[PDB]
């Protein structure tokens, strides 16, 4: 039960934390290009600040 609670439950809590952060890690890996795309509407909106 503990391994069921650990490997099949707690590791899925880790998984549901890892999967919820799986794209984070990819996004963290591609932090600048994700900023280049996911926040692409920042620099373009920055051009009209002045």
């Amino acid at each position: 039960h503990a391994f069921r609670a650990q490997q099949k439950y707690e590791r899925t809590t880790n998984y549901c934390l890892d999967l919820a952060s799986e794209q984070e890690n990819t996004i963290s890996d591609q932090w600048l290009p994700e900023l280049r795309t996911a926040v692409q509407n920042a620099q373009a909106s920055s051009e009209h600040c002045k």
């Binding site: 600048l32 900023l35 926040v39 920042a42 620099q43 920055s46 051009e47 600040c49 002045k50």
Partner: peptide, 15 residues
């Protein structure tokens, strides 16, 4: 020129 160049930094950043 300086306006468009500098403003991209924030984009770059009981039981």
């Amino acid at each position: 020129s300086l306006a468009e160049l500098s403003l991209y930094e924030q984009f770059q950043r009981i039981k």
